Amino acid sequence: MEDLNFRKGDAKTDVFGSDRMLQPSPVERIPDGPTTPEVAYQMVKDETFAQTQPRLNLATFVTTYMDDYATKLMNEAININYIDETEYPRIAVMNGKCINIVANLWNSPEKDTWKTGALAIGSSEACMLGGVAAWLRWRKKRQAQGKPFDKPNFVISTGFQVVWEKFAQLWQIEMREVPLTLEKTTLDPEEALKMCDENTICVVPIQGVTWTGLNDDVEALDKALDAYNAKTGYDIPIHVDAASGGFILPFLYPDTKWDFRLKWVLSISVSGHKFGLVYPGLGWVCWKGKEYLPEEMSFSVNYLGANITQVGLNFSRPAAQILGQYYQFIRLGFQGYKEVQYNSLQIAKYIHGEIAKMAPFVNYSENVVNPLFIWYLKPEYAKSAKWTLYDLQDKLSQHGWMVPAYTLPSKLEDYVVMRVVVRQGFSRDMADMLLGDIKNAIAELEKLDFPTPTRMAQE
Amino acid sequence: MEDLNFRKGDAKTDVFGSDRMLQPSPVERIPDGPTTPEVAYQMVKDETFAQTQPRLNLATFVTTYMDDYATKLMNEAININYIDETEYPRIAVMNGKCINIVANLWNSPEKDTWKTGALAIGSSEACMLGGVAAWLRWRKKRQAQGKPFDKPNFVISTGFQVVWEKFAQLWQIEMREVPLTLEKTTLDPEEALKMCDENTICVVPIQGVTWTGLNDDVEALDKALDAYNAKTGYDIPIHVDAASGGFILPFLYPDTKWDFRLKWVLSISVSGHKFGLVYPGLGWVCWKGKEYLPEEMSFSVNYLGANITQVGLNFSRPAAQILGQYYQFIRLGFQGYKEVQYNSLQIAKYIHGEIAKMAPFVNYSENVVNPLFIWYLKPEYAKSAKWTLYDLQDKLSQHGWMVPAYTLPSKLEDYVVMRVVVRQGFSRDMADMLLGDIKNAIAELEKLDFPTPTRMAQE
Amino acid sequence: MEDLNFRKGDAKTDVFGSDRMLQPSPVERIPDGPTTPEVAYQMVKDETFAQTQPRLNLATFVTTYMDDYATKLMNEAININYIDETEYPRIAVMNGKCINIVANLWNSPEKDTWKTGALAIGSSEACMLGGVAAWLRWRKKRQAQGKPFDKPNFVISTGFQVVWEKFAQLWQIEMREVPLTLEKTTLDPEEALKMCDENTICVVPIQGVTWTGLNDDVEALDKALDAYNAKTGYDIPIHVDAASGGFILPFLYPDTKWDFRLKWVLSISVSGHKFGLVYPGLGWVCWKGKEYLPEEMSFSVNYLGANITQVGLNFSRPAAQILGQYYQFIRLGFQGYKEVQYNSLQIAKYIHGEIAKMAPFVNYSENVVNPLFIWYLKPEYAKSAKWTLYDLQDKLSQHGWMVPAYTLPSKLEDYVVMRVVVRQGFSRDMADMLLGDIKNAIAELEKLDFPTPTRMAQE
Amino acid sequence: MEDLNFRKGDAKTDVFGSDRMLQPSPVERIPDGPTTPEVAYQMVKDETFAQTQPRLNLATFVTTYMDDYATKLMNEAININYIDETEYPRIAVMNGKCINIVANLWNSPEKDTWKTGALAIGSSEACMLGGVAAWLRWRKKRQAQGKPFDKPNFVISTGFQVVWEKFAQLWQIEMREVPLTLEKTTLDPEEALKMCDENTICVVPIQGVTWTGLNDDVEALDKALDAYNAKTGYDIPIHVDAASGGFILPFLYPDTKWDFRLKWVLSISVSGHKFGLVYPGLGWVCWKGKEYLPEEMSFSVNYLGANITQVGLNFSRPAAQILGQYYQFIRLGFQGYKEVQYNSLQIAKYIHGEIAKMAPFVNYSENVVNPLFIWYLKPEYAKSAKWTLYDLQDKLSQHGWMVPAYTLPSKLEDYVVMRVVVRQGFSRDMADMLLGDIKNAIAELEKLDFPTPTRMAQE
């Protein structure tokens, strides 16, 4: 009863009694022939085991949990190309309804029913589209005045997200960075303006700074930008990079003036897949009105009634994320959103509060305004300590966590900090697991008689 | 046994005996409060019924079928953010292996084990990244020569896919279009050269032109650019937009010199989610070597050994499409890919042959090189016909198909054609289903006594 | 539409917007009231994320992969209480058919159709059942001869699995251990016989020693015990603890004389859940014939014809694993089992060969007879290195592996070794992944300028 | 279009058009080669159809129903070996948390955070572990006092579950059984005490006697045992075999003192998979304090802070049952458990009352204290009846029920009784199916002209 092709991949072959599972995966060239689907599935699946478990990834801001209906909903949409809007005009309409809802979340004064906005893969695309719009708006002002427009720049805090370094690099637009200090933990409006000139296309406050977890004060900047634009006539605008906070501020902090309520906030961008609560692949950008979207980068198409804006860097793309975004609006609503973000912040507040009680630690800030915060070693403690926050990160890696240690950006670069992000799906109970794992590692590390490699590099 | 909250949304509630399902979906603002997951899932799902089923969308080139193992793998990766490479370094390595495999498919001569390329959401990003690299290469050449570099352009056929207008609009780069004429059904190299000057950053032939389904002769283009560059010193490169053909040519036409075998072909881009056989959300771009990627737009990070380039427009994004791509390479191999593309081309060739037999129709081309073709009305027949191909498109929409009718681009705008794309999952049995519907629809239209409005628009 | 009970747990509540997920899991007392299944599901599952993935668990010998049909079969049997043999007699018959097949794998000469054996949860119970049978056989001999029977002992290598320490402690039986040396790396028969006397109830050679991965030579042991029994007539028997080797030897080493072919081997025990290819919860013990199972610890019941032995320490228990074993026998057969174990041995040999090429390491043994081996630091190298294999373990923990470092048992307690177990579901591709992670970890460790904590204790 | 290998097992083979499904399943030897998973799935699955459906198995005490989340949780945990606690430490702690919760459910006064207990496969192992602990405690005292300790005994009711017969036989410990009469239907305490002496290691009252369903009065035993210990200094303890009642009494009878509230209750054991509501494979044992567990049979290892004791007969084993238990604690809580068991008791109370209304029947007790009871034929009716309860069992088997008839133990062995066990998943609606089928089967049995064989066997 011998099967002569049992190792070669027939209907009886066992994945791990086959010749294929005795060979390495392709690195350089495509294989000559096929295998059975089971062999191929394992080979790809098994490479995914040896890396961080997503729910334990505390570095990332991007959603790692959705409920079962949203996941079923999105999985079913796996083969739907959004850009085929004529074929799928209900999704095109859904897309516009999401833009409407988001724009209203930001107190947009636009009176068109179909609000001026666009779908994105993340804040990267959403940021870049707003940046190009401000770029084209500035170019067009300068020309009507006969001024040159061949050396454009923009202003941002040094605590920028890497998309703004791409934007500058990919459009050859100059980035001017406002450094961080212990006295100035967010973008100082006065320092930003000193870096502006006739060539500044916008200033970029950040709500939910990735390095620190804080919010640039946009209202102070708007009030400060107003007197300066009245002083210069440069007509410099604000683009708010709200990658995270754009889904925090509306629910937990309703009265904070940071959005389209403000005179100079002409556009905002956000990551739906962060605290908008949708699996990877979603971003949004909105303009205050149709007049802030240049015709050169945009057209609108009428599908079943909805004026749908056609601006975007990507073309064909997954549609599931729109199903996910609309589901979340309906399933949760405002109250529902308020409670989940409430949970996340309380947990971040809980961890923050317990971390400060520990001997080696001091928090970067006394206020947690986003479900994340950073801290560092007490300067006194680090002087005689034999370990760094890079070392604790390793200790936590042995238990499946990822909690990143990194040096801060300009004028605080001597500070090695650690960040914790609390997403939907990280419970109080999981917080207790992490804190327990931390206390243990401090004990192991406090046993050291010799300095770790990171600690020696710091000397 | 009365349940007092039956209509308000409790555990006993029926979705379609609820007060909420007597209400319309939110259009402008987020709902104040929540509903149950069943209600919210139905509300969003039910809107997707009233549009084309993806398997019957013959307008699109983008994948609507993958096997059950590829789908499961990808559904399981729904919460995996590609960009978290420190946290998921095995997927980052996997990503680099796909780039190697693709770049070798295109006969890259690069000697690195880690080939120079970048992941994309589709050809949209893939194209833009090649265009910016070509843009930066030109700026530095011209600076080094003391030449100006403030009025750049690029050259392309009028049958361009809209991403290049996006590129032109979003970088303020002049787009020069070579019309389609009756002499050549594709880009003529000599006419393309007449549109070049010292400001031309690249020329872009298309493999799998969306309007027609044919291939610009790149070797013929490559041979002329060689004589033109030696005349001018303009040193103009070729970027091949192979959104579809990049996954057709290597398998069915290996002897055709169109890729990195050509001297002036410095970069190629492809849509992984079209004929790379992967669900929406994948593109790839490759450079001929490390030196053709400008230092300004890219850096390398070493994960587990692999030199992984960190260039991209997007940041956080789904990783599932990477798992799918690597799966197909292993599950299919070269032979596996070869036979699947063979099926798709035969079925398209079959339909092509059947369309020519029908009295009203004649094909744009007698050579079918990609799994799609276009045709139009015999002029004699169209002169006395009371209907147009827009009418046939409508007749077929009533059976759930979407087969698009459209006018050709410049110098052929008088031709209203209809296109059929043959993707994986469209069988010979489905070809016969569609054809039967054409014969039926032709017969119904020939009974007409009066001209259709589109027919009136043609007089 | 505010849901006043959204946070308290109604039909609309989101899991991570609930009060419950602001609370830690119960530690001391049961919660006073209930929650919804979703919350409770999450609270339990989420605690399991922060630990080793089984497929990367290289410490364990126990099965971590079964195919999709085997999983479905067993999962559907979750609610079947095996001990209810009257209610579920077909499973009662099936279990006896497994025992027949296993005992025939061990070349039992028993001529009964229904071979003499028992179901076990693992080698622990299987070993314990054989040991008590040998205890009772000895009591009855000594009683029959007028000799005393109150001070029993048995003999085993120090490389024993902890079950025999439980056995000695829970029945108050003296354990006699033969130490390991580099000259005598498995149980030495001569030394083993020196520990026998009138009270020695049996000797336990081990096939698949957990500490080393080697097989005690049972043929050499049987031949000496034969001569010693001929000297004394003490009639001392052998129970083979073949926890791992029992599912290796019949297939890869059929000519190796280790089983019921040997005169004094009267019982054998094996773990089905190790290399029998069944998920946790299976062990087997067989005796050479009915006369070696005392009536005092067993009875027979005839279910549908099968004379079924009623021996065991456990009573009610999952039945699914019996379905799994029988599925494995049928789905694979002999050829099938041979090729699966060949893969794991080939892969284990591959790693063994690769480890020896590395400068810091020396393999404990040049022979790989089971899919596991151990190695340790070259003594010359360990002298000047600042790190130990315990450090290597921690390094591999940060990439998700568990590869255990430990000191060997008696007279080799100075050797810190590391072990790797290659189970079904661990491929050549995963070997390379692990191998890469080691090459990497050694280099980071060799940069140390100070000794690690474990290295200081070694001085 | 002939497939030449269709019957031999290729990709086209139908299971029941194959050669293999023309052959019998292996009985003696493992097959030479493999088959496809479908065939092997059918072959093993199909043998399970011809036996009692678990939900209709009224003999068993062991759980046959769990909700959908508990099932999935456990099913996903199929590949987790609990014993790998260093590899899966969150489960080791979870396990420790279950022990605490149970011990507190039994009102332990132990002052450690980590309560003293052990995981078990069922009451079989849990009992043996309590039994060995009591054995070693007595042995050590008698040594300290210079008395002998080679003739140990224990005291129990004849209504013991067979594990105590394994225990007595397998440890060579004397069992003294207190008989059942109609006057003493449970363990008589005074009779238990008269059988105690300096060699008695413990007394074992049973909560939920399997034969009858009643509770030995443990408080009465404790009260008498106190006076007897005060007189003798024999220091004799109580171990409660609470296989079922340990999960009934705390919830439905919280004020009945049977647990660690009693001075001499030093250990209690329970079946998690009976009325703990968990699928097969779960038991628990607890001691009143650390000093009642002998160091010779136990050690502790610190996992993440939790001191986890390492006592047990089993070694590797499924961990999935720990998740189910922990899930049940959180999902249900005290109120949740209270209502589920209340449902089970009411339904048994219902049937108990309905059995009494029937002419041939008399209930063993007027008390239903656990969700099970027994009854037998009215002696007046049984003298002239042509049938026995063995006949009633057979008739109901023709409808899929298993309702066991069996003789009671000593001094009631001439009594043939039938028992009905009501588990979770047995509804009032299912009670009504069963009662009807009995009335029908009784009507059929009373039509008999001749006695059944069992009826003759009683004459």
Automatic annotation (TrEMBL), chains A, B, C, D:
Signal peptide (from-to): none
Gene Ontology biological process terms, A to Z: L-glutamate catabolic process
Catalyzed chemical reaction(s): L-glutamate + H(+) = 4-aminobutanoate + CO2
GO cellular component, as recorded: cytosol
Pfam families xref list: Pyridoxal_deC (PF00282)
Cofactor: pyridoxal 5'-phosphate
CDD domains: DOPA_deC_like (cd06450)
Keyword presence, Lyase: yes
Residues recorded as bearing N6-(pyridoxal phosphate)lysine in the entry: K274
Highest taxon listed in the record's lineage: Bacteria
InterPro entries on file: Glutamate_decarboxylase, PyrdxlP-dep_de-COase, PyrdxlP-dep_Trfase, PyrdxlP-dep_Trfase_major
SUPFAM superfamilies, alphabetized: PLP-dependent transferases
Keyword set, alphabetical order: Decarboxylase, Lyase, Pyridoxal phosphate
EC number of the protein: 4.1.1.15
GO molecular function, one term: pyridoxal phosphate binding
NCBIfam families, sorted: Glu-decarb-GAD
Family: Belongs to the group II decarboxylase family.
Name of the protein in question: Glutamate decarboxylase
Source organism: Bacteroides thetaiotaomicron
Native organism taxonomy: Bacteria, Pseudomonadati, Bacteroidota, Bacteroidia, Bacteroidales
